[PDB]
Design a protein around this nucleic acid. Sequence first.
RNA 1: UAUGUAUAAAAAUAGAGUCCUGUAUCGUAGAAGAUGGGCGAUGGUUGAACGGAAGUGUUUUGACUUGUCCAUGAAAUUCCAGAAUCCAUUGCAUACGACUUUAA
RNA 2: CCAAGACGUUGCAUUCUUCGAUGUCGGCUCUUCCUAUCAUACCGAAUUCGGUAAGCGU
RNA 3: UCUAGUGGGCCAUUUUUGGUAAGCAGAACUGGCGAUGCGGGAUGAACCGAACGUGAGGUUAAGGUGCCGGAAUGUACGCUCAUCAGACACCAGAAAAGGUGUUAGUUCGAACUAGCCCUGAAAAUGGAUGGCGCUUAAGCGUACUACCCAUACCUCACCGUCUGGGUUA
RNA 4: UAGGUCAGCAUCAGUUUUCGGGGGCGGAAAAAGAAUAAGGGAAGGUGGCUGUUUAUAGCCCUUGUUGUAAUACGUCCACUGGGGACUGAGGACUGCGGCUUGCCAAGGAUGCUGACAUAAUGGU
Lengths: 196, 125, 97, 168, 175, 146, 106
Amino acid sequence: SEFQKVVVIDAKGHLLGRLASVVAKQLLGGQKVVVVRCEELNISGHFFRNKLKYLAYLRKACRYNPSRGAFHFRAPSRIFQKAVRGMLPHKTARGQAALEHLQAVEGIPPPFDKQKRVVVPAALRVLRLKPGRKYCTVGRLSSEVGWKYNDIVAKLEERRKVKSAAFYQAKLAKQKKIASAKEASPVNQKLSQFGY
Amino acid sequence: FKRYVEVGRVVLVTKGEYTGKLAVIVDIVDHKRALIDSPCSEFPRQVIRYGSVVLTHIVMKLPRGARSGIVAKKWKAQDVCNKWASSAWAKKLEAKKVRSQLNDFDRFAVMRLKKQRREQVNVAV
Amino acid sequence: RYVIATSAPKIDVSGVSVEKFTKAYFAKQKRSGPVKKDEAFFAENAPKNALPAERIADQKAVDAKLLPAIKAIPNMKEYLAASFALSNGDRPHLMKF
Amino acid sequence: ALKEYQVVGRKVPTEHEPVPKLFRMRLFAPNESVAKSRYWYFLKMINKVKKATGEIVAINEISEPKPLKAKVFGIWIRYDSRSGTHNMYKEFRDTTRVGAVEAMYADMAARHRARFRSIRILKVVEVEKKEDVRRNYVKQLLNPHLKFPLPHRRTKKVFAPHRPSTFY
Amino acid sequence: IYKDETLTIPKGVTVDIKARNVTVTGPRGTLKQNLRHVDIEMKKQGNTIKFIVWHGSRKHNACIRSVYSIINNMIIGVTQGFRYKMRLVYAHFPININLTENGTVVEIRNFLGERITRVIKCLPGVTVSIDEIILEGNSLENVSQSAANIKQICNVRNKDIRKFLDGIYVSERGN
Amino acid sequence: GLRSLTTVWAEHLSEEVKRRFYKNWFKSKKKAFTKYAKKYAESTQSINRELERIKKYCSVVRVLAHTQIRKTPLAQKKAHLMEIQVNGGSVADKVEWAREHFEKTVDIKSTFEQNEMIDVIGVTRGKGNEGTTARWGTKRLPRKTH
Amino acid sequence: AQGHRLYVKAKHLSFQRSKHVIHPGTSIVKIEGCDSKEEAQFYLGKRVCYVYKSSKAVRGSKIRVIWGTIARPHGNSGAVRARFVHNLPAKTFGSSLRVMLYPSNI
RNA sequence: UAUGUAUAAAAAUAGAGUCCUGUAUCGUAGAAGAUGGGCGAUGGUUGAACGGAAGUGUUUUGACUUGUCCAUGAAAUUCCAGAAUCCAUUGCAUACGACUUUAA
RNA sequence: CCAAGACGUUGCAUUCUUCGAUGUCGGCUCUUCCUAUCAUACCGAAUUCGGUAAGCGU
RNA sequence: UCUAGUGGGCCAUUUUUGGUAAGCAGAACUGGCGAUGCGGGAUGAACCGAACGUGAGGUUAAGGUGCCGGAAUGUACGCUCAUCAGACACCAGAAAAGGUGUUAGUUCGAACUAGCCCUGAAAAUGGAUGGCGCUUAAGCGUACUACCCAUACCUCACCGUCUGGGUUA
RNA sequence: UAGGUCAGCAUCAGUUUUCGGGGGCGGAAAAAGAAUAAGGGAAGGUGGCUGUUUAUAGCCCUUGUUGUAAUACGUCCACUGGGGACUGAGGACUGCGGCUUGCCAAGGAUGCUGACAUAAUGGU
């Protein structure tokens, strides 16, 4: 257990409910949480079943003024926020104030692409679903129910990945130089019996 | 795959009272259990589940269902001791064990020494 | 209840008398009156005033008697001069002092 | 939590039966109280002796003689279902009779939805010859060159910094 | 506990199965397929390919031979390829076939006298040439799908099948 | 969605389009775009960086155009201003076309070709408040209605 | 600047409650790095404080403190129970507390 | 609401570039961090280009040296705390507001 | 469902509320939902019968 | 001995009568509600636990521990893939017969017998395992520990009633 | 000497919670196992050539010795070492005990200190 000022979570390969439950508990603990790459979130069950579930969600509306009726957000970040909102006591000022500590986004915008992004093992698809079980991605589900910025995020994410890769090569070179100069120091053996 | 559950494989127990101990698969009871043994006296022959152990890369020749005495002599013959330690995985494990056992004065001495170590940061231009 | 006994090597204190340190030795002065406090009162006490030369001599004597031990054991003088502090990722119930 | 119990008992002496016969059963129960209860349950249904008119003459716990040897146990049971007309024979590979019986109870509950009351164990025997084993999965475990990958790796501290390797 | 199948690698140059993707490169061409849909070990040892299934049920084990057949078909396509010849059948109105983009697009006209021109685009890697049409390619599945699409395009609707036998049917399919 | 990265104006803007920025042009000091004109004359490099930014990052280019309403017989003197999307060619070509056409006029003969099917967009003539018979076309209730 | 913080970070989770009834007298405190009741046994009896800042300078200080003591563990996850001299306000849920290292026994 | 407001590869999981998570790495000694000195190093911390996805930044081009020894100082805090609107005008609008105009 | 679609078989009055009062049929008007589909679209079986289908009309 | 109120009852278990049926009418035994809060069943007069003076501490019942929600994203072995799965008694409802569904069993490849799932299954404002969501479950069956908390139990303080023992200093 | 408000520790008492140690007894006087002597056995067959019976691996079954073995479990100690929390009712003496007349953890909390003497605690 550890407390960070803000936690940026790479939502790739995570399960919607498992991550939303972990995030919702952290928000109620008073911690600010940022969730990036919401279009890569996974849901158990094949897509068609998930698509039918969301079409059932679209059916809910007020018989008078659907503008009062339930607002069905299509963006993957908004889907994740909806799952978290159903896990927070949002009608209450405590659970409402815990919502503005959550910022779910699609892709990794500039303020967060230069920050460490941790993952939640309790919500990872590889560690939770038996192999061979069908699953869908929220990004593809959103693109079929109305979300219309799928390929823009894909292009911007590809460009960001290239830039991040170039940074990593620079960091690898610097760390390689540090490691090479590390062993030359005689203290490396003077620290050996201490376990360092 | 490089880890196969087979008779003679060296395993490292990761859950239970025998956490951190080294053993060898003497027999395979079923897909979820196996009978293991260790030459050390503190580790008795027992049936353990696959969830509480991790498969090491060392495989030693051992007949099926060998008694503890046969297991001990084969363990000494194939010098599994210090053969497991030769791997960097074991070296990291003992480093963590030593680091945990460090006291306050040792931590201060480590701080000063690694301060002297970080002093150089000398790289070719 | 307000000390953590570290596992650092012991210091030889057999060579210094400790029987003169008693409750009466460290006791404060009697007041028996609610009237207290003043800017001049804060100007009083202090290290400069009070602090009898007898207390000064004992502190100097015990200090000089404890230098030879801490000089003999390496890295103890800097260890004593330093200040203990917790950093990120330090769990007191795990670390042993 | 089961323990194998040998229970010997007889009906109380009477004028008609001055020397009543002694009946002994090997039966698995969590404690001595249940073991005696099931023992009277089986006698009450077979030999016309009630716990009121009978008595337990000996109670003993049987420990596995060779618990460090992998064995195969074949269990005949009289499964009771919605129809109640079922006889089952199953084989389990384990190191102790108590362990095999407990594995049988869990297996019957999981597959056929059978409770401790529905199942009654007719006989548990040790299969010593490989050719006597008729279960394919047990024979597969009896393969001389058995070896398989470790399944279900799965390996608090929420918010791990690196993606798990979950591999070898 | 273990189910194993063995296949002999042909004279094909590259049989790379990195990341569970089979990029089979041979003298005829290079075909890339994804085998991540099945959790099967493809163990490559010289000129032998071993398909192993561990702790699999009947349904899981049945996919082992299916994957072996798929790999064999990919090897055959990368070695010699697959060619399917279909003969058009016309009774009164001749069927006009036009090839575009070197046979990548097949346009059918005057089918049963209809004035609507049916345009079908063949799958990548399949070439159609000319009352017989031969489609040749490296991906046997793609060639078969293109042939099926052509047959479905040339279909009779709301007519008696026994009397109206017009259409295009596959005659032969080999290497 | 789309986000307006930046806007570049011409050096000289006519009084007709400047009146669009004022509710009370008579009383105003007519100070709109004065400092913009000054910076345009003294330092064109800042303008050049702005145009380069549009060429480098922006994917959509729209020209701000106003109508010479003083040529029409209308009492209105505020020129109508709008954004017209420039399609065709690369973004660099659109910017070059836009910059070279600053302060110039574009005639409808260039745009439309005497037979084109176009859409006409406008606000319909206001009929004020109306009842459901006229607003919605419902049937009139019988003469006997109370 | 990392030569201070002789305490342990903690967070005020909630009150001792059932589904529908709360007991404001005792608070549930989650100590960082404590993940089981065995670890919480070390922190039993320690002095946990809630520090806050207010406009008016009582004693010429902008900071007020509510003191308290850790009483017993709570659950299997290492959360503890604390009794404060003045019960903690219900608005301090998710606020940070400071668990000193005294009264020490190590 | 802070007490170190320390950490930027992408990936697959029947594989990745040694693995078997970060209990790790980076930083951490000095009146909440003083005043001096000797050796050693020539490092370290701090007072124009690039970045548009939300570019809030990144990169580069006068104090302070705990790299290493030495000497003074701390206390009695003597046990926890220049525009818009009105007035006026317009009818492309209009129940009234509002809207569209004009008005030095 | 069963085989000779018969024979069988399995499914989809009360007086609780209102008597210090819930305006009582039909039409007209207007809206919306269901599908157990009349027409339209798409296939399938020998102008005749079914499947998806409540979009639009009736 | 004198007198009040009552002399409309209702629900549940098991037994049962009239009835096509009923949240139907009529009875028998016991317990409840009426007259009764409290913890649990999302919610509810009689269901489950437990019956209540004011408080402190500890421990429990029924029920539970993914989040909402206090408490194990516990342990062991399995079953299940559902194009509108399943999810805890009362209880908020479903059947015969079926399945190139799957896991097992029994008997001579075959017939079967059993679990889970699916079909049978078919409505009208948008919508309910309580919600979110859940698929090597956060579903289902069984075992096993740890943990959560009622006004219940336990120790203690105080209030009142009743009861018994003292009190001519 | 005695007394105001809030605190910290100590030694006690009552209640309870949570870790640990030593010992006794019981069971098939645990079952096993180890080391060491025998007999017998076959394999899912080691060396030797698909087949055989400890060889250039071993396993199983039976019996003795070490053995009066150990450990686990059950159970008890008027055996014992810590950590935490709430509580301090009563008010000279009487009692029941222990110790050695005085003392004592024995018929309900005292002791040693500090800060503030404040709007601190408490009330509204």
